[PDB]
Design an enzyme around this catalytic site. Sequence first.
Site, mmCIF file in Angstrom:
data_model
loop_
_atom_site.group_PDB
_atom_site.id
_atom_site.type_symbol
_atom_site.label_atom_id
_atom_site.label_comp_id
_atom_site.label_asym_id
_atom_site.label_seq_id
_atom_site.Cartn_x
_atom_site.Cartn_y
_atom_site.Cartn_z
ATOM 1 N NE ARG D 54 -3.037 -0.017 2.911
ATOM 2 C CZ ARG D 54 -3.390 -1.356 3.115
ATOM 3 N NH1 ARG D 54 -2.572 -1.827 3.802
ATOM 4 N NH2 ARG D 54 -4.442 -1.608 2.163
ATOM 5 C CB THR D 55 3.770 2.412 2.072
ATOM 6 O OG1 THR D 55 3.151 2.251 2.932
ATOM 7 C CG2 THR D 55 4.752 3.609 1.925
ATOM 8 C CE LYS D 84 23.442 -12.715 -2.686
ATOM 9 N NZ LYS D 84 23.110 -13.100 -1.506
ATOM 10 N NE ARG D 105 7.421 0.967 4.898
ATOM 11 C CZ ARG D 105 6.235 0.289 5.682
ATOM 12 N NH1 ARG D 105 6.067 -1.107 5.854
ATOM 13 N NH2 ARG D 105 5.293 1.006 6.438
ATOM 14 C CG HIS D 134 5.887 5.361 8.050
ATOM 15 N ND1 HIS D 134 6.053 5.967 6.854
ATOM 16 C CD2 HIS D 134 4.886 4.555 8.042
ATOM 17 C CE1 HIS D 134 5.203 5.443 5.966
ATOM 18 N NE2 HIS D 134 4.590 4.516 6.700
#
Lengths: 146, 146, 310, 310, 310, 310
Positions: D54-55, D84, D105, D134
């Site tokens: 959703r974000t 890696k 995020r 956030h």
Amino acid sequence: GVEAIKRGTVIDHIPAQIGFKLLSLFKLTETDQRITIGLNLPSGEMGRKDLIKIENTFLSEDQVDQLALYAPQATVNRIDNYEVVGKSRPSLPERIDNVLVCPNSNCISHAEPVSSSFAVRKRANDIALKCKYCEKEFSHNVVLAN
Amino acid sequence: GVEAIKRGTVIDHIPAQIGFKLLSLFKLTETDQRITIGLNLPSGEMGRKDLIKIENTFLSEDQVDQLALYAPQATVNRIDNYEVVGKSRPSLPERIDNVLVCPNSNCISHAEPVSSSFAVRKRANDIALKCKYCEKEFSHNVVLAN
Amino acid sequence: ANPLYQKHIISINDLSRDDLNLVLATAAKLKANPQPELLKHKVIASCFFEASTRTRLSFQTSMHRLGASVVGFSDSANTSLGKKGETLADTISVISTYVDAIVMRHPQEGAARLATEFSGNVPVLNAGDGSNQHPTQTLLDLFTIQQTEGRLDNLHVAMVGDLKYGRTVHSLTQALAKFDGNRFYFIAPDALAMPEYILDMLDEKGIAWSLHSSIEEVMAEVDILYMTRVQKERLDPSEYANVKAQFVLRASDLHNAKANMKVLHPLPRVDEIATDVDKTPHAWYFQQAGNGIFARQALLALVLNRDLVL
Amino acid sequence: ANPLYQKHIISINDLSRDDLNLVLATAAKLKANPQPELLKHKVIASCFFEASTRTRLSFQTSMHRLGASVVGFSDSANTSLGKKGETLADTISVISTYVDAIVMRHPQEGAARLATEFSGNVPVLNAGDGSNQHPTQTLLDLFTIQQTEGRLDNLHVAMVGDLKYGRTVHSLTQALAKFDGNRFYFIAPDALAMPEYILDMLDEKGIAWSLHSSIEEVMAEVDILYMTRVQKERLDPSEYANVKAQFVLRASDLHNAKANMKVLHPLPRVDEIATDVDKTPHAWYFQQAGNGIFARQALLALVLNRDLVL
Amino acid sequence: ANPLYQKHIISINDLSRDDLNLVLATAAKLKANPQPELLKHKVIASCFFEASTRTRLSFQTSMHRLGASVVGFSDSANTSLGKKGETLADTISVISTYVDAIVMRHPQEGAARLATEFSGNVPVLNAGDGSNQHPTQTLLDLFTIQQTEGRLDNLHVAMVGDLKYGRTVHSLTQALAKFDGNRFYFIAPDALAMPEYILDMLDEKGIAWSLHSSIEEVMAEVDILYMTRVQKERLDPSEYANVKAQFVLRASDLHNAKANMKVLHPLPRVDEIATDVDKTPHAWYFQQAGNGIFARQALLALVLNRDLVL
Amino acid sequence: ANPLYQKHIISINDLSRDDLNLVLATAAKLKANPQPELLKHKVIASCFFEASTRTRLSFQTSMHRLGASVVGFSDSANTSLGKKGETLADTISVISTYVDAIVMRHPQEGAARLATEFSGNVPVLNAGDGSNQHPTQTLLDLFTIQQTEGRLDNLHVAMVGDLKYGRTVHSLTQALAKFDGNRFYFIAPDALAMPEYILDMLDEKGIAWSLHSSIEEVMAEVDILYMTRVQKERLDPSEYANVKAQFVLRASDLHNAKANMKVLHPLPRVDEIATDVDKTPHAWYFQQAGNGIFARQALLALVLNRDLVL
Ligand SMILES: Nc1ncnc2c1ncn2[C@@H]1O[C@H](COP(=O)(O)OP(=O)(O)OP(=O)(O)O)[C@@H](O)[C@H]1O
Ligand SMILES: Nc1ncnc2c1ncn2[C@@H]1O[C@H](COP(=O)(O)OP(=O)(O)OP(=O)(O)O)[C@@H](O)[C@H]1O
Ligand SMILES: [Zn+2]
Ligand SMILES: [Zn+2]
């Protein structure tokens, strides 16, 4: 079978052991009005019957028709001023919205906030119930079992 | 008013809307026997109430006690030759079976073939119920939402 | 407004003959003189809750060829918030607040129809809801049948393979059964034969169909051969291999096929069509796939556009 | 240049009252008369090292609604080169050489702040760094509180559920605590109550707050009810279910709620809000979600644009 | 020497009526007067390449009930066997250098007969190899039918369920067809019918079998009811459900069966035999399970012991 | 017969002071004069549906120390048990047809008491069922406290760690509350405090308990120190850390404890008891582990053996 209430519906000759299904199912029990229920009565031919009296409530044409799968010979008497000013029988509906569960386990319906819906079709011999969502057709025999 | 049968049990003073819940939870309708149910019978006596009359049937001791959680004040009546051969009222039983559901979501009573068993303990302000299986003790309020 | 403007495209049986045609006529226009700026400033969401790369890539190319922006996902695994308790209902209640149309593929039948009730006015199109519908594939199969043959009427179409379970064969039959004069030959292993109800509908309309044990019996009568992939694991390995001299097409079986006969398949194909078929001029499955773009462009252009001047 | 031009948006506490307002005023402009060609030719990178659909979908729709191109990813699993041996530092040193802004995020707290030191001049915006910040969610929560109420001052806001661990409740309190006259009622299970430090700050500013055992105690006083999802597994299953008559909203609890009271939730919701709430006109969580677009468009428009004429 | 000495039990097809009778007469004496140090000092490999904990547990209890030691493994959820290209041939060639007997279940049909060629002189007992054999489960079924019926001949046997794919029911039909006067009734949906080659073998020997639609038509004359599991994955979610009324056994249904009638089932029993049949004296599937211990012990004793005098 | 004969050990709550004393007095004689062919010819199922190799290994060594055979499994990392909808009821109904005793650990609270209803007459010994019981670990703790303290009454017991969720510490409190004059000291962070119902049971019997902040306040009068693991997942990475100074035991801390003091721990001990406590004579957690063998053997002997005279 019993006597008087002024104004209200009397649903007489509901098979037997179906009178509770109908109460349970269409939630006729969530009123504040007197309801009298009579279970496994004589005075209707078959001897044995269930009967429901809900005063000040009158059932609409389509509500009458929701009975049809369960109690097709139910007489829905309309009472006003102590006398039967109307009599209906359940006809077969085109849509039995809300009271059945689609037997197809992968139908989205199960998990969600949607009222079930099935298009009803063919009279008496076999009734095919088609789920709205998965668009699968089922014999009323299977749907009306789980 | 709903009021006369020869022999049986008349459960009277069920506090409104519990009268339906008792038919379902205790499966009183699975008898082909005269049942007269009166829902939201007025009786100024208690405002509004429900009444089950089951004919030629006598609940006994244990059966009477289970009602205690739900209709704690029901007067249960042995009618035995057209009138009241003895009354009773709900006494809290030491264990409630089959009717309640465990709140413990991880209690195994949930998937398996087993009827619930809860032991009743009136913990001062209310009653606490310890599950047979997960042994978790719960506020009966928590339990009766289930 | 065009007859499909702001409509939801959920199931083939929900579109009339005239709708199928409108779609199929637009799709031929957008093919010849394209307008690649027509959905300039719309944002379509590509929600594959089941993942399919070829369908995802076809629809997203179509969105792009009309100048639209895509937001979207895929998984066949936990996605995150979509999985964390969320009901498809809530997922849709929330994305219809962001986007202009929703295209969605999902594992449970009826997924896109429940969506229709939570998307507000945002149209949702079905990219495949479980074993029920996949209206977008049938629209490009019909565009391809029409573009190779000239019509959707009076065709002898043969359907082959897993007629019992393939979504596609069932929708193609219901859609061609809206046109007239068609004849259908069904060639399936009887463990996998056509369902009774497809057949029952076909007799209510007086539509001609026959059952055949092998493609050679109809090779010469056929106009469209719709191969479907016999899915191995529905059968026992021994069961699967045991069947006769199979129901797989090879180039030499095409020797008696009409000049205009084309072979179609929804893809993936594997051992149902052998490579030598790819060489013959009857091989049409990859061109079919290519018509995916044009057919889906029509549908997007139509749902999202008031009047199409093309 | 606008006060946030080329700034990094990392944490709410780093934005003043005047910044929150600038953002929130732009966002109302872009809502009413949109400019969908404003970031024409910029390329923003959507780097979800933790995945959130959703974000991700909200921010990417916002990038698209201003005519920008996105490059980006997600995983919650090995991605490849990113895994890696690569330090987030190097990942950022390399993408800031490609793109114009970074939205990211990540699972570990402080991820987007370390990024700020390796992105050169490329602004990075935080889409959620572990359990710390956030800032983008709080900006759309404030835009929604302001748009339903008329102001961010003298509000009686009730916060409910997992007040201990929800990122969102902690940022919303620090942000509303920059405005005046607010009153906060905190309704949490005490295993999950509000942290001491949120409360300590609230008393340094002389801000009024009270603790309540259940939503009914404040139902009538409340303007914004911010429900937060009680996350089940932080509690014992038996523990979780045992709590009273819960802290979940049902439509009937809304009977005494003011006419302008709206219910908000960050989503996902599951058993904290029951469906009958969705029907009442106080249900505002999906509209909230929708303001995600407009709020994030403001922020993108502002960081990436010299002077906004709107 | 006894006739089954040092012999590999791979198929029901390789065992004769006389061998069926000797293995069943041994089990009888082993159930009555147990011999707990008969296979004292013997080490048996229980190699389950396909995981099957209920068969595993049976076989291993049977080995311990006789004093044998057990080594071995269960894979499918990866141990290490059958990787780095190691062949089943080399694996059995190495295990024969330690154990006195090999019990193995494997996912490919034929595996147990291949092990036979590399074990040299260690007997190989097959606990299930793909869709093909499983002699040990037929031997416990036969021992249960003989225990309860008193006879293995002149029986009326109904076989209800998925007979197409039911491996168990195919061997019991071949095993029982070795004895006289048996009559069979097959009750299965059409997509799960008793395959032709079984039906051919029956006719060719002059054995009587009928097909019925409901268990109810045949309840009165049935001696043994063998239920088998309808594998829902072999049918659609919708196909399974709408079998118009189903093939489940319920205690009401049995209110009619002869006194001697016994309901058998290889297990799991999921949906098909309802819980109320358990209280019925006809329910015998658990007691069937426990006789697997005796058929298993008979076999390990006869194969490993040159002259058994008990 | 002995009082625990053929009895199922499910809870500490079902065992009386006298039973605690008989199981502990048996273990004493079994530790001193061992009986290695007492359960000769018995087969015990060790069914670990939840994987717990240290309890598993203990229970199984205990079974072999007495001549019992062992069959069984460890799942969580999938064997096969509890799939294809097979119920725990049917699983135990089938395992009772082979084994003489069932030892089981399962992830749901209540499982062991359900097995009890289907095992018929095979005793069910609970090796851990969800957040609820684990009698066998209390019995080894009690046997260790009695071995070292000489007494199970008049003790000063500190319980340090996560007492909210510590299953081990909840049963030891209920077990010890069965004896006289015991005094408890609970040392736990506030979010991990000894739940109320325990505290209620203590008060109701007149038992003395205090809460302390540091182990240091109580070191001098403590006889038994029961450490338990702080489960970091129950707290934030930041919450765990900043317990201002922590609840770890270090050998410096004990430079004060009485001669008889013994530090116990159910294990793993990760961070909470430092390595230097191991060289201290007070360290007893490993010797505690080895007494599980004796408490386990006592139990298997008493449940399966009608009159034990040793
Ligand atoms: N005043 C009333 N109050 C309550 N129930 C009533 C009332 N009048 C009729 N009923 C119920 O209606 C049923 C009979 O009504 P009604 O006269 O409509 O029947 P009918 O089917 O038209 O019969 P018929 O021709 O034999 O008179 C009975 O169950 C009596 O149970
Ligand atoms: N013979 C009977 N058949 C059916 N029900 C009866 C019978 N006698 C009493 N009842 C029901 O019992 C209720 C009244 O019984 P009862 O006299 O025990 O009440 P009470 O509470 O003792 O009242 P009170 O002092 O006012 O007389 C009524 O609901 C009536 O329907
Ligand atoms: Zn459905
Ligand atoms: Zn429980």
